[PDB]
């Protein structure tokens with residue numbers, strides 16, 4: 001039916017029309033495919049930004065720094081987004097990308113344990129530096145879109161080196177959409193502490209039949225853009241490829 005030339009052209013056009021530069025990497029079984037309008041982004045390093053929340057949550061839970069029902073209280077200080085001015089569980093903080101919660105979690109884990117855990121799972125360049133509460137936001141920790149799709153593939157298949165229950169607890173936190181029997185699990189990212197800014201959407205689709213298809217979208221955000229472009233491009237791409 002549809003030629004891969006036409007798939008490549010369609011997905012490129014989604015990035016072109018959002019007036020950005022980006023890539024989406026899709027993995028099917030063992031085969032990695034790179035689509036978009038700036039393919040060379042695929043092996044370039046960027047800050048993980050809020051995508052690190054997934055591994056922050058795995059580490060915190062595995063090491064009993066939190067539980068999935070624990071309510072992280074708002075301290076009452078003004079926050080960047082009014083939606084973050086409330087009490088929340090890790091799960092809620094995951095959907096809202098509430099960095100103050102993931103910062104508190106990182107502080108509980110602590111620098112020594114954080115570094116050792118980031119090494120053990122071999123995440124990105126694995127370097128967190130000396131600042132426990134912003135290493136995923138402004139450097140030194142970096143990761144390529146290929147490395148992110150591989151992380152999502154690992155987590156989707158319970159292959160990371162954490163208890164199965166830890167991985168299931170985090171995965172539950174990541175359900176963002178259901179489309180005709182398919183379930184989309186993903187974590188968004190928007191790094192505003194770097195120039196240029198980076199947008200991420202990394203997760204997988206779980207199809208009706210049980211197959212999991214991981215993906216990582218990576219693009220350049222500029223002041224002005226709506227964050228929902230990350231989602232809109234992702235769904236359009238997955239739909240174009242008949243994955244959903």
Ligand SMILES: *C(=O)[C@@H]([C@@H]1NC(C(=O)O)=C(S[C@@H]2CN[C@H](CNS(N)(=O)=O)C2)[C@@H]1C)[C@@H](C)O
Pocket residue numbers: 049050051081096097098099137188189190191192226227228
């Ligand atoms: C982490 O990257 C960063 C989070 N990440 C996001 C995000 O949307 O991925 C935000 S933006 C904030 C939370 N969601 C609201 C926007 N919704 S949407 N659909 O993206 O337009 C406002 C924030 C910058 C941490 C480090 O702050």
